[PDB]
Amino acid sequence: ILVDKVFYEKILSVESFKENIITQSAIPKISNKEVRLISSGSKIFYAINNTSPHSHVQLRLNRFFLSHIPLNSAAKAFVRGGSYLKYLEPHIYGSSYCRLDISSFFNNISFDDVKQSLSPYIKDEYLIGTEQKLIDAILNSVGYESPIRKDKGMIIPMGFRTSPAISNIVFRKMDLLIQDFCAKKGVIYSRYADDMLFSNPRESKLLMSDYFIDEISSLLSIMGFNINQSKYISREKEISINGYVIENKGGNGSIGTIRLSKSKLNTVLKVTHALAQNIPYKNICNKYIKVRLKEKNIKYESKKDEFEKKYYRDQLINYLGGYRSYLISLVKFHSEYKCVNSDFIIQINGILNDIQNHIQKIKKNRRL
Amino acid sequence: TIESIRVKNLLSFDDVILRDFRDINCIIGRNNVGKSNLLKVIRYFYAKLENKKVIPLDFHTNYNAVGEITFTFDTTRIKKIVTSRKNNGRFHKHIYNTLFKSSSVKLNFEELIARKNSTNKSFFSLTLTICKDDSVMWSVDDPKVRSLLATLYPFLYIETRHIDLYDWNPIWKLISNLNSFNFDDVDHDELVNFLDEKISSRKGDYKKYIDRVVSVIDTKPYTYKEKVINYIKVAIKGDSNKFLETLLHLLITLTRTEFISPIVYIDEPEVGLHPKLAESFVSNLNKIYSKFKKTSELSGPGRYKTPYPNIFYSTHSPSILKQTIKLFGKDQQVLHFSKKKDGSTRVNKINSTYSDERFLNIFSDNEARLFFSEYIVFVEGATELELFRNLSLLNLYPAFSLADIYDANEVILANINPGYSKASIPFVIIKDIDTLIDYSIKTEKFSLRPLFEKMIKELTKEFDYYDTGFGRVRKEIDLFSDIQSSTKKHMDSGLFFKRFSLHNLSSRINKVSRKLNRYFMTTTIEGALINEQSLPYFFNWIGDVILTQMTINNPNPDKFIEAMRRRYNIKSQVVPLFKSVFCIGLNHPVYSSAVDKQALRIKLSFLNYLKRKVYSDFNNEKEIVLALRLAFGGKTETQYTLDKLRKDGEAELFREKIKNYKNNELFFLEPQMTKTSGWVTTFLNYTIEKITSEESDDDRIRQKLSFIFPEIISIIEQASSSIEAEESSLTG
Amino acid sequence: TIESIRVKNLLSFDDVILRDFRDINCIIGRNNVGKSNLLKVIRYFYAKLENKKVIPLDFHTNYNAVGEITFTFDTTRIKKIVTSRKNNGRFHKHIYNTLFKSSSVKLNFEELIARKNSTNKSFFSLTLTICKDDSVMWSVDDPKVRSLLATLYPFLYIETRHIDLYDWNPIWKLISNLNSFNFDDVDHDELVNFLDEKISSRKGDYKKYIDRVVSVIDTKPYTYKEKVINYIKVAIKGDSNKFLETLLHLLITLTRTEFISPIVYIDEPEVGLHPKLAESFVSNLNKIYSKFKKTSELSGPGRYKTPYPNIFYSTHSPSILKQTIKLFGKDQQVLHFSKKKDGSTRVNKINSTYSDERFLNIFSDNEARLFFSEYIVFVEGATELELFRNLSLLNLYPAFSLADIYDANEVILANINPGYSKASIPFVIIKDIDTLIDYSIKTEKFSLRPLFEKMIKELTKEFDYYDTGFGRVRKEIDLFSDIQSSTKKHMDSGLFFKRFSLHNLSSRINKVSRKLNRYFMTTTIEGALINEQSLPYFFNWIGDVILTQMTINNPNPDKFIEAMRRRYNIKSQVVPLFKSVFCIGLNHPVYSSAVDKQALRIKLSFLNYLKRKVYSDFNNEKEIVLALRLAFGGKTETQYTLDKLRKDGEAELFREKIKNYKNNELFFLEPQMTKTSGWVTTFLNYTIEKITSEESDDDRIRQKLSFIFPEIISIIEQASSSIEAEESSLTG
DNA sequence: CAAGACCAATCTTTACACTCTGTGAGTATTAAAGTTACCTATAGCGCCAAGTGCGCAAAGGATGAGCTAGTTTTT
């Protein structure tokens, strides 16, 4: 695609910035008054006001501009049709497994690289007189000046909406270089967000050597990215990644298996046991699911109250339905790729039957 | 043996996977490029297995750096054969050195027992990677494994269009590969001595001749394959469709006492063949297949339990597909390729197994033709076929001519199951509102048929979380349950509706059921054919029928006309004169000028009389339309037909008036009153001719057709819009 | 514009004449050798027209000494053009001196005027004779005539199986020979000067470059055709199915302003094509054909009255034939080749023009498939299709599988008209005896249907002389006419016949109507399926249905069975227990050993009860067969069904007993009791499997099937004998 | 800490300037026709003005109603 001057007027800015073209005034940047500082742990999330000119521009950019630029197949995140299961599937054919993590992936993206990457897809011209360019006007809606580090310029906040697409587009040459490096070594490589998974099917100690991590660091140093040494994992014949266990011993042409550990399914089993033990819903939605109805918003517009038994019940039903959908997704992945252990299939079938029976019992009790 | 083929980023494939291979796998579609690319991928993989230097394949996109081809072999029979204590040959022990030894020495004593449960399957995976710099890499770095896999699972490709009938190399290769004899034990000297003793006037004469020939023909020595070919030729007695049949029969027969399972690909087996010839070819293949089957009571010598080889064939003929579906049944599958929105080959499975035996027995060419379509319109009655297949109507809409219209029943729809093949073959099911709601005259309440209940149950999905655009639809579902009683009032003695128009209910039902690919017409097809805006055209068509079809029964027209005018009254007794003078005949002779004028005057008088009678006996332009619609076997408003009213015993006056009109002036239309008579085609042709005579431009005629016929034109426009939206995918 | 082609004693022809050519002539058949021979004959004739040295063709038999090829050209338009006083040119006068000069100077002043200048069609006949000594002779000894005929009626041949897309020689040949421009007026020097002026930095550089190039590349000068091709190529802006489409479109377009009428032959237009592609090809050809038509009101610029060229098709695809029949209509014909008894090619015309618009619009692939058949069986109902298309039944008779069965009504049969192509496609029409004779209960007399009267009239032959053996037919016709009253007596209250048996009359009418390719069955299909000899097999099938399909509705079988045994009596209340315990289900669960034993005991008790009631209520064992074949929508003896008897108000006791049996005990069989349900296929498969298990030899099982089912086996045997009689002729 | 390995495509080709019409020794030297491009864009829910909006989220009758929202990963 090639966005021109007319495209920004009839597609990208239909009613939010239409008054800044006839007036011949430059499009302003995002001020500090239009963003929040939501914090969770040692992370900062930059939110944006819903009633802002830039939010609709971001929506239009995501739907019409940042959805046609080609990507690399090694990226399994923030794309149409990607999933974590597709991120773990290709490595069932390997015997050695290695994992790497990128440190501060969204904070180390230089805005110059973003400007250069989107340059071929936007023509070189002037939007508002001989004062502002189209590329700069578009970039003013996808960047924010961090007040925490005044020395730094304009960065890509984590909490915006166009950030994942920009991260995928910018981190494309690195994916190509890493894939080319791994192809010559016979190593399967996949990437999800900023986590890289490497699999070796042959019997070798390449993934357990410092040479591999040194080469990956050298490749990443072109864009200034770094990998933290606190999340370096390298194992053989089995690996656990956030409860997903991939196992393959293999001597020649062997196919591994993917399952989920019991620690991954501990919470749902506890919820099922509590529900079958006639535990009241008050101590189930607050102890296991961790969903609470705060007194600051307990029907702020209604003094009738006496609706807790419905709110908690429907929240529990939503939780069980979501977990059932997750298990159904796993079953569909097994059906389409056939890389799940049979005993785990039996276990998840039993769990699904139990969950469905509990949902039916909850509905019947609510009716009665 | 091969159970999975996966291609990533090669030619026209982004990520394609093929599994579940039957014995008679069949491939159909409109994107021949995809089939050619699949054949190229398979041939490239098998050429690289044999260590041959070939050009690497191209990439789909240059934003990647690798191209993967993955093959999975079901090494179950070989594992059982080799790991048996009764087998101690060199070949078995060699096989248990590169296939089942590396993966077994790493196990322990608790899983080896679990791997011998007589119900598990052993798989071997081989992956080929092509790099950006035209480099080839393998997951297994051992040429011995590749050679063994190639010699255990050979691949045979047959081209039927450009075939040389004078070359028998595939036959000789198949014979040489499928042998159980060691030809090296034959002594050349002993055979030469035997031949020399057989033909000799003196001892030692053929040997001298052979030696003299060899002394000057000195070339490279025979290879083993050449020797076995010569022995087979000296042992046998003799050297397009026949070649392929011989290949298939020989492959089936020879692969009965050996553990080698080849894979054969056949391209266009029906090139230059009569349809009966193709049917006979498939039938002969099926008979050969069934002759060597040992299942249940069928036993004895000559019957085996050895698995059959997999056969792939691509065809463009419905006859071969029909024969394969009817004969093989459970042992076949149908693959459909198509494309994508951006452009990329797909692979889908089309349902071809039918539980009903009647459907398989009455399987014909229309069912097979349904496979080779890009848009299917399912209808129930035979009038929809007559309306949607009109040649004149389809001339103005060159987008609906690409669809196929099929008469389908409920059981036929269940057997076909179009839902399984939805992304490959889009379809629409057109029904009537009668199948959902039933109305009664005595008790003024609606009732829901079981089909409506089934649709409601399917729409009502439980075990779900909350969605913004999900509750409202459910509310409508609840409203449908509220139509369980839905007391309403009917005027004109159960003939019309005072309120509660069915148009809004039908629109809501259509909006709900658009997700299930269904459309419910407000009325019958003939209801859309004749309406308030088409009555002048119907009257003009009736007048044209009177003017043209009616002829004088007597050979002399002038004398007969004069006698009947002097016998019967021209005004009061016009009906008996018309009955006794004009008759329907295929031939329309031309009479004299005076006779033609008299006939025209009589016809005009009859037309005026009938027009006045129909305008006076019936009130407003709403009862004549209903009378005509009910006359041609139909129903209106109350969903009651003319025959159903008589059974229910209602509207005596209306039925008596209709019966009087049928046994009176409108007596020449009685043959056309019956269903499936042919009045739809004639009316459509006359209307099209009239409109194209009145209006010149090709857009004004379509606009006037839309004005006259809103419903059928709306259906055609919707189907055309869907086809155009999905045209870029289902097009070669 | 050729009218007649005659071949005598050449290749595989004895005396073959082809005439009445249309624009869209289509050639189909099984004998491809005949088509190849016809193509070779045409090519040989046109090569000898242009004075080319080719090998003479072979003789069919050596007991003759000559082989003749005769061609007739319709030289009517050219005569009108030349003989006009308005045209004064060299070519017109030369054509007159070559063609119409000799034949016109031998006529007086009376035949020329008012006898050959009004509507006459002029013909030119050319004969080529091949002698025994490979000598070639012409009927006209003038090379100029042959050259003019060749240049006025060119012949083009297209082969699509082996076609090179990189060669455009036919396109340039068509373009060069269909232009009205003289290219000799374009001087080389002025064009070179123009090109030099257009592109030059110094004057004369391009001319000097061209001269230097020519001085080195000096070869033979351009011919006229090469010059015109180069001019066309420099004028235009650019250069399997697409090539054929372009050729046809150019041929149609360029001939609208010329008096040259080419003849085109195309072989296999559908090779390697999707059915939709072939349909689109035919549709585009028809649209381009109709674009340039100026008939009646259709006038204006761009529309002409020039005749279109002749096109011949050689196809094996029903789709192309269907499209050609539907679109072109009266401007097409279908040819069938076949063979003879001793071996010789024939040519016949198959009817393809229909006067019914509904039939043309509803035309589908089955009608086209009827063309590609060697034996057609026409039936009325849908049960005949289910009976004659059974796979197991056809497995034992590998001679009826070569015939195709079609459902046709009287109007469909009239439109198809199978009698026209009787010698090419043998056919048999199977009907029931009810279509000829109608019986009544209130009035004790038979009646004859109009079809019987039409058959009698056709059989009756006035204007004839005496012939031995023809008086028997007249006597039979007189007896059929006089049997109009045929007073008889019916016993069992209008249910049976005293002594008629409906068998002698059926045999006599079959013998009479065998000459018209008709067969009247004594009873209906269901009557032949279940007869007095098939009661044990029908009872066994019912018992198997009870054993298999009936399952426990309750999820827990043991508790439900125990409760119903302790609640309902096992002997007196067996029917309510069976109704409330066992239900028909697609899935059959497996129960415990005790539960299975209890279910088997209950089923055996139910079977014993039903058989005892059946044998007690009815005694003669024939009323059992009557009730069985009447409950399955059938009529017997008196030709009466349930509805007909109820309307007639006869046999109240029998109807009440049947209703009690249906609504009391056989409630589970009811769904498999309506027409077109599927019981025929299941019963046939079960019977065939049982007999196969009992008897191993094919002869034994065939004999047992003949004994059990006499009528259908007799029909199959007669059809097989008819096919075997004509197998040699209708097989390539 | 610092490091060689820094994507694909950006529309596609094709081609001497001169004064001399056969020859050219810059301190840092592509570009103009032809020929296709192509995106492409529209209502929680209902209502009346029929999409460009307005109102409401209690019926209803123009601002009491009343009211929540799934799992996992990245992070």
UniProtKB/Swiss-Prot annotation, chain A:
Mg(2+) binds at D101, D194, D195. Keywords: Antiviral defense, Magnesium, Metal-binding, Nucleotidyltransferase, RNA-binding, RNA-directed DNA polymerase, Transferase. The gene is ret. Residues 19-246 form the Reverse transcriptase domain. One of its GO terms (molecular function) is RNA-directed DNA polymerase activity. Pfam families: RVT_1 (PF00078). GO terms for biological process: defense response to virus. It catalyses: DNA(n) + a 2'-deoxyribonucleoside 5'-triphosphate = DNA(n+1) + diphosphate. Its EC number is 2.7.7.49. It comes from the Bacteria. InterPro entries: DNA/RNA_pol_sf, GrpII_Intron_Splice-Mob/Def, Reverse_transcriptase_msDNA, RT_dom. It is an enzyme of class 2 (transferase). PROSITE patterns: RT_POL. The keyword Magnesium applies. The keyword Cytoplasm does not apply. Belongs to the bacterial reverse transcriptase family. Reverse transcriptase (RT) component of antiviral defense system retron Eco8, composed of this RT, the following endonuclease and a non-coding RNA (ncRNA) encoded between them. Expression of retron Eco8 confers protection against bacteriophages T4, T6, T7 and SECphi4, SECphi6 and SECphi18. At multiplicity of infection (MOI) of 0.02 cultures slow growth when infected with SECphi4 but do not collapse, at MOI 2 cultures collapse. Responsible for synthesis of msDNA (a branched molecule with RNA linked by a 2',5'-phosphodiester bond to ssDNA). This is Retron Eco8 reverse transcriptase.
UniProtKB/Swiss-Prot annotation, chains B, C:
It holds the Pfam family AAA_21. Coiled coil: none annotated. Keywords: Antiviral defense, ATP-binding, Hydrolase, Metal-binding, Nuclease, Nucleotide-binding. Residues 173-242 are annotated as: Dimerization domain. ATP binds at N32, V33, G34, K35, S36. The keyword Hydrolase applies. A divalent metal cation 2 binds at E384, S605, E623. It comes from the Bacteria. It is an enzyme of class 3 (hydrolase). The keyword Nucleotide-binding applies. Residues 1-172 are annotated as: ATPase domain N-terminus. A divalent metal cation 1 binds at E380, D432, D434. Residues 243-372 are annotated as: ATPase domain C-terminus. GO terms for biological process: defense response to virus. SUPFAM superfamilies: P-loop containing nucleoside triphosphate hydrolases. Its cofactor is a divalent metal cation. GO terms for molecular function: ATP binding; ATP hydrolysis activity; metal ion binding; nuclease activity. Changing K35A: No longer protects against SECphi6 infection. Probable nuclease member of antiviral defense system retron Eco8, composed of an reverse transcriptase (RT), this nuclease and a non-coding RNA (ncRNA) encoded between them. Expression of retron Eco8 confers protection against bacteriophages T4, T6, T7 and SECphi4, SECphi6 and SECphi18. At multiplicity of infection (MOI) of 0.02 cultures slow growth when infected with SECphi4 but do not collapse, at MOI 2 cultures collapse. When the retron is cloned in another E.coli strain synthesizes msDNA (a branched RNA linked by a 2',5'-phosphodiester bond to a single-stranded DNA). This is Retron Eco8 OLD nuclease. It comes from Escherichia coli.
